[PDB]
């Protein structure tokens, strides 16, 4: 009755003409109003295979976020190695709003409602929708921020867990707040706060889930082995500033006292390695005043150490995969199919 | 892990080579070919799929954990060493070398005492040559005053001669000048398929 | 066309460090990981790790962690590798490789269809040394054997001819062997009519470029 297919999707949101925040504005231009009355039809005795690691929907969102960052996070200068270009450095008011992705006529989206569907394989409970849920294009590394949560219990996602070059995505079933602040009045000294009790508890659970998928071998965490600061650190955009937080403390093996509040040292940078492609971008000096973002950790990105053989141990390090993986962490349960 | 066999493989042009690989984990398995002094070339991946420029002669197959690479109608270019691979892991390798079949030929055996020029330097090398023989298997047996020398020498063998299809082997026993002058009778004993009985070439220290 | 261009080979001493480069071309460098693999003669090939030119993320085999460093220069598409605290165990030919499937959408790292030419690295305490050449003198059916012993040179290789190449038939130049001292040795023999020894003069042409030593050793019956 239907077949798998790619196509051009359109976006839908709740963006308002009166709101002047940049993402909101981009949406009033790109998207249409969210459907007033969604219709989800459960598909009777049906089964479908999904593959989140090969979902064209991820590519389309990618191009939008690249579009979004071109008109909302324009840097003062770009260093592309081959050239150095100057340009206006507009003050940035950016706060991602939920974006719905929808199919045009003759196509449709399929949704997997298996409460522990890990992202690949057949799905039992399948339904049909015209649009994804609202997804926020939050750009970050190591920690996935402000996303949806596992509806059952923690889920380990990977194209193939035995392949060390494949990204691992952890999907928490209970978010944990990460409170990030940079006091006012070195105007780069920033920090983040997390409840050690809540966090470490969530670690026990994820490692216990991780151990489950590695024939019961001891699971240990280590800091990244190398690469750019965007990669070796938790990196994200808060109130137009680029934070870079040291995550050594979150992945503390021994804590798996250790009950109080752990606080990460972060630094704010004006010169950054652009994610959209290649080259360094230069943003303006830090504005004065207290800057504070409180986000919900909803997922983790991990890379497994390779070349083990002997042991007995599996070693995981925070990060990094790829930015498209953030979208995958949200698009996993959807797929486009064409009628006939 | 990945256990690859056999270690070595002596075959003639025209024959078929069967290299084996045992896995325990499974997942896209690949085969590589390395020619003397060159970078390895991908030959097959997914256990059964040929790469670009790889002819029908190369084929792979599978049975459970076991994986085979098969090379039919061997030709000069095919010889080298082959590796199986699973993700980051490789097999120990299998060396496939050329042995053109021919009539059995016994070795000509020569022994060389150390030159005076070398002895002046305070060291001594005794050399035993086994020339132009077939097949390649052969045994060398050093004896110093009837004492068997185990692990005191080094061997080196040529590749099969292009003209007569024979092999040649050189064995070198090295000793201190002082040690060399301790003993008298230096013997080299050669056993081979072409010899109805082992051949012993020898000499006495300091005798023209 | 996809091309991996490697810097040449080198000789290190134990304790030192080594650095290699690998410039990729013919494709979008950021698309997929670069790998570094070592192959030691008669030894199972070793994957050292991979680097993703995007962000410069890395993955090191347990064996090498703390000793190896992989980085890249995205502008020149060049991958770099360093290996510290070298031991003889490190002697090997070092390669960079890239998987076959490498698009923008995705990849598959482990099918190495692309390899650099390789960089041969030997680590030992031997210093470059030219060979002393000793005669292997013939002795009195109709054929006599003779040669030169090329002993205690480093590093490989040495080349041997006879009477300036005029004499090719019967020549057997054996593969060099590595002595327990770190120096190489090899022999070159030739068979001739034992009636030529009286009149025919036989010369050993030894060339060891690494030390610029070129010897013409006359072999004669003793
Ligand atoms: C994770 O998601 C959470 C919510 O799910 C999100 O936290 C929100 O952050 C935004 C932006 O930081 C906050 O909105 C602000 O509200 C205050 C007033 O209380 C304003 O000061 C802020 O800016 C105003 O003034 C600016 C001056 O330049 C203007 O530019 C701007 O337009 C505003 O007028 C801003 O409006 C929002 O309150 C929080 N919500 C919570 C619950 O904290 C967080 O940012 C997300 N994390 C990441 C990394 O995206
Ligand atoms: C197919 O779905 C119909 C609609 O409910 C149901 O009655 C029937 O049992 C299903 N068939 C199978 C084989 O499950
Ligand atoms: C996903 O779930 C099923 C097993 O129930 C199957 O597709 C595969 O083994 C699982 N993959 C992971 C990474 O758990
Ligand atoms: C999260 O999942 C774990 C299993 O991984 C389960 O034990 C725990 O209760 C779940 N938390 C919630 C809030 O459901
Ligand atoms: C964020 O941390 C600041 C500084 O510790 C604290 O005052 C504030 O209450 C925290 N925000 C939340 C939501 O806990
Ligand atoms: C994070 O902090 C740890 C412990 O303070 C320090 O050793 C390490 O250098 C830092 N990591 C990065 C990537 O800056
Ligand atoms: C596979 O290897 C087995 C092991 O000996 C051998 O019998 C069989 O012939 C091989 N298959 C092929 C196609 O070479
Ligand atoms: Cl891969």
Contacts of A335 (CB under 8 A, 6+ apart): A4, A48, A50, A51, A55, A57, A109, A110
How many Å apart are CA A97 and CA A134, to the nearest integer?
Answer: 8
Which secondary-structure segment (H or E) carries A242? strand A241-245
8 A C-beta contact, residue B171 and residue B140? yes
Contacts of A273 (CB under 8 A, 6+ apart): A228, A229, A230, A279, A280, C55
Q: List the beta bridge partners of residue A100.
A: A12
How many Å apart are CA C115 and CA C2, to the nearest integer?
Answer: 10
Domains of chain B are 1-106 (2.60.40.10), 107-208 (2.60.40.10)
How many Å apart are CA A272 and CA A251, to the nearest integer?
Answer: 25
Q: List the beta bridge partners of residue B105.
A: B134
The two three-digit tokens of residue A126, written as one number? 């399948």
Q: Which residue has the tokens 């072999």?
A: C219
Which chains pack against A, by 3+ Cβ pairs within 8 A? B, C
Helices and strands in chain C, H and E counts = 0, 19
Q: List the beta bridge partners of residue B30.
A: B85
8 A C-beta contact, residue B205 and residue B181? yes
Helix (H, G, I), strand (E, B) or coil at A230: helix
What Å distances lie between residue B30 and B26, B62, B85, C31, CA to CA? 11, 12, 5, 22
Residue in A249, A266, A76, A53 with CA at minimum distance from that of residue A165: A53
Residue in A45, A124, A126 to alter for ligand 2 test, most ligand atoms within 8 A of Cβ: A45
Measured in angstroms, the CA of C66 and the nearest CA of chain A are apart by 9
Strand pairing of A10-13 and A32-33?
A: parallel
Instruction: Report the CATH number at residue A173.
Output: 2.170.40.20
At how many degrees (to 10) do helices A57-70 and A22-30 cross?
120
Strand pairing of C107-115 and C202-208?
A: unpaired
Helix (H, G, I), strand (E, B) or coil at B16: coil
Q: Rounding to the nearest 10 degrees, give the CA dihedral for residues A56, A61, A63, A68.
A: 180
* Alpha helices in B7-72, H assignment, sequence order: none
* Residues in chain A, overall count: 340
- The experimental technique behind this entry is X-ray
φ/ψ (deg, to 5) at B64:
60, -120
Strand pairing of A168-182 and A189-195?
A: antiparallel
Q: Which protein residue has the closest C-alpha to ligand 6 atom 6? A: A248
* Alpha helices in chain A, H assignment, sequence order: 22-30, 57-70, 196-212, 229-232, 324-331
8 A C-beta contact, residue A77 and residue A281? yes
Query: For residue B206, how many other CB atoms are within 10 A of its CB?
Result: 9
Which secondary-structure segment (H or E) carries A328? helix A324-331
* Residues in chain C, overall count: 222
How many Å apart are CA B87 and CA B105, to the nearest integer?
Answer: 46
Residue in A176, A182, A184, A193 to alter for ligand 5 test, most ligand atoms within 8 A of Cβ: A193
8 A C-beta contact, residue A306 and residue A147? no
User: C21-39: string of b/e by CB count within 10 Å (b at 16+)?
Assistant: bbbbeebebebbbbbbbbb
For residue C190, what is the nearest residue in chain B, using CA coordinates? B131
How many Å apart are CA A143 and CA A206, to the nearest integer?
Answer: 14
Which secondary-structure segment (H or E) carries A66? helix A57-70
Q: List the beta bridge partners of residue B185.
A: B204
The two three-digit tokens of residue A48, written as one number? 């479908």
Contacts of B53 (CB under 8 A, 6+ apart): none
The two three-digit tokens of residue C214, written as one number? 């070129």
What is the total count of domains within chain A?
1
> Resolution of the experimental model in angstroms, please?
2.4
Rounded to a whole number of angstroms, the CA Rg of chain A reads 21
How many Å apart are CA C99 and CA C113, to the nearest integer?
Answer: 6
8 A C-beta contact, residue A97 and residue A52? no
Q: List the beta bridge partners of residue B11.
A: B98
Query: For residue B199, how many other CB atoms are within 10 A of its CB?
Result: 17
Residue in A30, A65, A22 with CA at minimum distance from that of residue A277: A65
For residue A309, what is the nearest residue in chain B, using CA coordinates? B1
How many Å apart are CA C200 and CA C138, to the nearest integer?
Answer: 13
The two three-digit tokens of residue A317, written as one number? 């390090």
Nearest to C117 among B39, B90, B91 (CB): B39
- Upper half-sphere CA count for residue A73 (Cβ side, 13 Å): 24
How many Å apart are CA B141 and CA B143, to the nearest integer?
Answer: 7
Residue in A49, A52, A53, A118 to alter for ligand 3 test, most ligand atoms within 8 A of Cβ: A118
How many Å apart are CA A196 and CA A194, to the nearest integer?
Answer: 6
What Å distances lie between residue B3 and A288, A306, B84, B85, C49, CA to CA? 64, 19, 9, 10, 22
Helix (H, G, I), strand (E, B) or coil at A69: helix
8 A C-beta contact, residue A340 and residue A200? no
How many Å apart are CA C19 and CA C70, to the nearest integer?
Answer: 10
How many Å apart are CA B68 and CA B63, to the nearest integer?
Answer: 9
The two three-digit tokens of residue B84, written as one number? 């199986």
Burial class (CB in 10 A: 0-12, 13-18, 19+), A336: buried
Strand order in the sheet with C159-162: C159-162, C202-208, C213-219
At how many degrees (to 10) do helices A324-331 and A57-70 cross?
130
- Whole-number Å distance, alpha carbon A45 to ligand 2 midpoint, is 6
How many Å apart are CA C67 and CA C74, to the nearest integer?
Answer: 23
How many Å apart are CA A246 and CA A241, to the nearest integer?
Answer: 16
Measured in angstroms, the CA of B167 and the nearest CA of chain A are apart by 41
Nearest to B170 among C42, C115, C187 (CB): C187
Residue in C26, C27, C21 with CA at minimum distance from that of residue C5: C21
Q: Which protein residue has the closest C-alpha to ligand 1 atom 26? A: A93
8 A C-beta contact, residue B39 and residue B127? no
Which chains pack against C, by 3+ Cβ pairs within 8 A? A, B
Which secondary-structure segment (H or E) carries B109? strand B108-112
How many Å apart are CA A259 and CA C70, to the nearest integer?
Answer: 37
Measured in angstroms, the CA of B3 and the nearest CA of chain A are apart by 13
Residue in B125, B138, B132, B133 with CA at minimum distance from that of residue B186: B125
Cβ of A295 below 6 Å from ligand 1: yes
8 A C-beta contact, residue C60 and residue C49? yes
Give the 3-state secondary structure percentages of chain A, helix then strand then coil, rounded to 5.
Answer: 15, 35, 45
φ/ψ (deg, to 5) at A255:
-75, 5
* Residue span of the structural domain in which A185 resides: 1-340
Domains of chain C are 2-125 (2.60.40.10), 126-222 (2.60.40.10)
Strand pairing of A32-33 and A241-245?
A: unpaired
φ/ψ (deg, to 5) at A109:
-105, 140
Nearest to C145 among B40, B42, B129 (CB): B129
What Å distances lie between residue A239 and A76, A292, B175, C27, C176, CA to CA? 17, 8, 79, 37, 69
Q: Which residue has the tokens 């005794």?
A: B126
Residues of A in contact with C65 (CB under 8 A): 225
8 A C-beta contact, residue C94 and residue C119? yes
Q: Evaluate the omega torsion of the peptide bond into residue A320 and state whether it is cis, within 30 degrees of 0.
A: yes
Rounded to a whole number of angstroms, the CA Rg of chain B reads 23
The two three-digit tokens of residue B202, written as one number? 């020898």
Contacts of B178 (CB under 8 A, 6+ apart): none
Strand order in the sheet with A126-129: A2-4, A334-339, A107-112, A126-129, A41-42
8 A C-beta contact, residue C202 and residue C167? yes
Ligand index nearest the alpha carbon of residue A209: 4
- Upper half-sphere CA count for residue C202 (Cβ side, 13 Å): 29
Biggest alpha carbon–alpha carbon distance for chain C = 77
């Amino acid at each position: 009755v239907w077949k798998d297919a790619d196509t051009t999707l359109f976006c839908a949101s709740d963006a308002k003409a009166h709101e002047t925040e940049c993402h909101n504005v981009w949406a009033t231009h790109a998207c249409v109003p969210t459907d007033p009355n969604p219709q989800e039809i459960h598909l009777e005795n049906v089964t479908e295979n999904f593959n989140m690691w090969k979902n064209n929907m991820v590519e389309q969102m990618q191009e939008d976020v690249i579009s979004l960052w071109d008109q909302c996070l324009q840097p003062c200068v770009k260093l592309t190695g081959g050239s150095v270009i100057k340009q206006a450095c507009p003050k940035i008011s950016f706060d991602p709003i939920p974006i719905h992705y929808c199919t045009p006529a003759g196509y449709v989206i399929l949704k997997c409602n298996d409460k522990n569907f890990n992202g690949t394989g057949p799905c039992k409970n399948v339904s049909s929708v015209q649009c994804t849920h609202g997804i926020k294009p939050v750009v970050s590394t190591q920690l996935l921020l402000n996303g949806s949560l596992a509806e059952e219990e923690i889920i380990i996602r990977s194209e193939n867990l035995t392949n060390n070059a494949k990204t691992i995505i952890v999907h928490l079933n209970k978010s944990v707040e990460i409170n990030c602040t940079r006091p006012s009045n070195d105007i780069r000294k920033a920090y983040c706060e997390i409840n050690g009790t809540k966090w470490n508890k969530v670690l026990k659970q994820v490692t216990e889930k991780l151990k489950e998928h590695f024939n019961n071998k001891t699971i240990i965490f280590q800091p990244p082995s190398g690469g750019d600061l965007e990669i070796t650190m938790h990196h994200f955009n808060c109130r137009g500033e680029f934070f870079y937080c040291n995550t050594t403390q979150l992945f503390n093996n021994t804590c798996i006292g250790c009950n109080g509040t752990i606080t990460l040292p972060c630094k704010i940078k004006q010169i950054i390695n652009m994610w959209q492609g290649t080259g360094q971008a230069m943003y303006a000096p830090p504005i004065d005043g207290k800057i504070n973002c409180v986000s919900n950790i909803t997922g983790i990105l991990l890379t497994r150490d390779g070349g083990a053989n002997n042991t007995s141990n599996e070693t995981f390090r925070p990060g990094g995969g790829n930015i498209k993986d953030n979208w995958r962490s949200e698009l996993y349960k959807y797929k486009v199919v064409q009628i006939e | 892990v990945l256990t690859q066999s056999p270690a070595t493989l002596s075959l003639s042009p025209g024959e078929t080579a069967i290299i084996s690989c045992r896995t325990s984990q499974s997942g896209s398995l690949a085969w590589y070919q390395q020619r003397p002094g060159q970078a390895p070339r991908l030959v097959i991946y997914s256990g059964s799929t040929r790469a670009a420029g790889i002819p029908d002669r190369f084929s792979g197959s599978r049975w459970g954990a076991d994986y085979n690479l098969s090379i039919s109608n061997l030709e000069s270019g095919d010889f080298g060493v082959y590796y199986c691979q699973q993700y980051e892991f490789f097999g120990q390798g299998t060396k496939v070398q050329v042995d053109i079949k021919r009539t059995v030929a016994a070795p000509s055996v020569f022994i060389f005492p150390p030159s005076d020029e070398q002895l002046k330097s305070g060291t001594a090398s005794v050399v035993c040559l086994l020339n132009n023989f077939y097949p390649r298997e052969a045994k060398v047996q050093w004896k110093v005053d009837n004492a068997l020398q185990s692990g005191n020498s080094q061997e080196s063998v040529t590749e099969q001669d292009s003209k007569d299809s024979t092999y040649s082997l050189s064995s070198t026993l090295t000793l201190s000048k002082a040690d060399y002058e301790k003993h008298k009778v230096y013997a080299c004993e050669v056993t081979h398929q072409g010899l109805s009985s082992p051949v012993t070439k020898s000499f006495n220290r300091g005798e023209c | 066309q996809v091309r991996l261009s490697q810097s040449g080979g080198q000789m290190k001493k134990p304790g030192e460090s080594m650095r290699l480069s690998c410039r990729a071309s013919g494709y979008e460098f950021l698309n997929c990981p670069i790998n570094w693999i070592r192959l030691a003669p008669g030894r199972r090939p070793e994957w050292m790790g991979w680097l993703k030119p995007r962000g410069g993320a890395v993955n090191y085999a347990r064996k090498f962690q703390g000793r190896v460093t992989m980085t890249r220069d995205v502008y020149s598409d060049t991958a770099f590798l360093e290996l510290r605290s070298l031991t003889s165990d490190d002697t090997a030919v070092y390669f960079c490789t890239r998987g076959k499937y490498c698009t923008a959408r995705d990849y598959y790292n482990w099918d190495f269809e692309h390899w650099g030419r390789g960089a041969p690295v030997t680590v030992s305490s031997a210093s470059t040394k030219g060979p002393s050449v000793f005669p292997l003198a013939p002795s009195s059916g109709g054929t006599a054997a003779l040669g030169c012993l090329v002993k205690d040179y480093f590093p490989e290789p040495v080349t041997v001819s006879w009477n300036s190449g005029a004499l090719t038939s019967g020549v057997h130049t054996f593969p060099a062997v590595l002595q327990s001292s770190g120096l190489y040795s090899l022999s070159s023999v030739v068979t001739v009519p034992s009636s030529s020894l009286g009149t025919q003069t036989y010369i050993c042409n030894v060339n060891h470029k690494p030390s610029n030593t070129k010897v013409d050793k006359r072999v004669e019956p003793k």
